[PDB]
């Protein structure tokens, strides 16, 4: 499984983590291998990585946790373009899933 396909997926995974709430990498680790069955234990360098990068983009947006005790928590949130990004994601999938089967129902048919 080559690095190009393990980075998409990995994004498309911290995108609907995102999606269902607010959390923070270590948190988000330990929900993706219980949710892997302990197959994908996420690194917490490719979290922060990935995140950076979707910053800039602003796909999502960072905020400090309460600090009662947690003296340094960073939480990320998936912001409105970034719901507004998936949601044409989304569009474009099912999009493509009409033109194939009409593709195949056109070519039989000639």
């Not at 680790?29 to 917490?44: D, F, H, P, R, T």
Request: charge should be negative; proline fraction near 1%; aromatic fraction near 8%.
């Amino acid at each position: 499984i080559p690095k190009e396909l393990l980075r998409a997926q990995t994004n498309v995974i911290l995108l609907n983590v995102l999606k269902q709430g607010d959390n923070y990498v270590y948190g988000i680790i330990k929900q993706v291998k219980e949710a892997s069955n302990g197959e994908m234990e996420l690194n917490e360098a490719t979290l922060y990585t990935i995140f950076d990068r979707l910053e800039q983009d602003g796909i999502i947006s960072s905020y400090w946790g309460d600090e009662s005790q947690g003296g340094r928590r960073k939480y990320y949130r998936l912001t409105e373009i970034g719901h507004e990004n998936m949601r044409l994601a989304x569009e474009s999938l099912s999009r493509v899933d009409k033109i194939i089967e009409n593709l195949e129902a056109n070519k039989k048919s000639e």
